[PDB]
From a paper:
We also crystallized PrgE together with a single-stranded poly-A 60-mer DNA in a molar ratio of 1:3. The obtained crystallographic data were refined in the space group P212121 with the asymmetric unit containing three copies of the protein sitting on a string of 15 ssDNA bases. Compared with the apo structure of PrgE, a few more residues are visible at the C-terminal end (until residues 136 of 144), continuing as an alpha-helix as predicted by the AlphaFold2 model. The DNA does not get wrapped around PrgE, like it does with E. coli SSB; rather, PrgE interacts with the DNA like beads on a string, with the N-terminal tail of one PrgE binding to the neighboring PrgE, using interactions between polar side chains. PrgE binds to the ssDNA between loops 1 and 4, where the beta-barrel is partially open. The binding also bends the ssDNA between the protein-binding sites, resulting in a kink at every fifth base. Many interactions with the phosphate backbone of the ssDNA are the same within all subunits, including with residues Ser33, Gln34, and Asn37 in loop 1 that form H-bonds with the DNA backbone with the fourth and fifth phosphate of each stretch of five bases.
Here, we characterize PrgE, a proposed SSB from the Enterococcus faecalis plasmid pCF10. Structurally, it has the characteristic OB-fold of SSBs, but it has very unusual DNA-binding properties. Unlike other SSBs, PrgE binds both double- and single-stranded DNA equally well. This shows that PrgE has a quaternary assembly and DNA-binding properties that are very different from the prototypical bacterial SSB, but also different from eukaryotic SSBs.
Residue numbers in the entry:
A (entry chain A), B (entry chain B), C (entry chain C): 1 to 136
The structure:
DNA sequence: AAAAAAAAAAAAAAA
């Protein structure tokens, strides 16, 4: 094919350790998956510069519930959830950017490659239940 | 099978230190993989005779982008890109030879043996971002 | 059990010193491995009566490559490679006998016992390049 | 809960 300038790629030097972490959604991209689903690609920034990615895929039974947990995590980091129809729309897209969240980070295999993946957005209850088990 | 001069093999004494470097594509070579994929074998040379190799495999869905990043790295080193169809062809083969590039080199574990392998080709943006964080 | 006459064993008094060497393929004999692959057993005679052995083992992914390098070594000693199918056949078998080659010999250890073994066949440029860095 | 993902490349064998 003919050359077409490709995009700058973000350096993902450092992953999240396994467990629960406070993180901020440092970026939100609108993309389409390889199987042709509309998704929001949440980029996640930790307090020691840990980078992580999360895919909010649309057009299935879980999408609604999935996003409610993202919103609930935002709510419990001290932000009011506005009166808007949440889903595949610009309000939702813009609302997520820059927000404090609680994330879970589990291991995950794919093509025999193990990485630390962001799996879930946690409520206050879930974040503390997990965090109050750790010994300094 | 009928005879086919195998590719000359060099002394891999000095390899690239970890991180990102300016390099040249010293040699390009046609080669069939163990799984039976066509690839170009890019020999990279550094400013103090560090050596490394890069496997540009054809067939995969990443081929295009992977080559795009090679080309874009060449673009950002002062060479302009011809209006040719880039791929598994002769023009591509001849173009890549003797071109200044930006590369990343990470640690790569394979069957016990860790070694410093060229992983990516970097754009100007990518390159300056990681090179500007070094001190004196 | 019942006595069968055993075969004469060739006197392997002196072995190659480590490094690169001009040598002749003095003998070639096809055998079965302990694991049970067909293979050629190249005997190699040095210019000071050094004796070494090389095992070209058939039935693996790199059989053809290892053979190609042998032929390349013969090619670069003033011999033209004919348009023959190279492999486990009589023609390849008989072509190898008596040819000049360049060999590499390294230390090797099987059952505690150390041995100078023939590990590779070198091209012209490969041979000269090894001889360059010996003078230092 | 369902869906997301850079793919691919590396001697093996002899004794």
């Amino acid at each position: 094919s003919k050359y077409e300038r490709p995009l700058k790629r973000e350096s993902q030097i450092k992953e999240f350790e396994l467990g629960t972490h406070a993180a901020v959604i440092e970026k939100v991209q609108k993309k389409r998956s390889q199987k042709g689903n509309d998704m929001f690609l949440l980029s996640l920034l930790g307090k020691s510069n840990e980078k992580g990615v999360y895919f909010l895929t649309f057009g299935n039974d879980y999408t609604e519930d999935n996003l409610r947990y993202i919103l609930a995590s935002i709510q419990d980091n001290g932000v009011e959830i506005p009166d808007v129809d949440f889903g595949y729309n610009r309000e939702t897209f813009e609302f997520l950017k820059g927000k404090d969240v609680y994330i879970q980070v589990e291991e995950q295999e794919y093509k025999g490659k193990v990485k630390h993946a962001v799996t879930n957005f946690l409520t206050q209850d879930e974040f503390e239940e997990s965090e109050e088990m750790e010994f300094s």
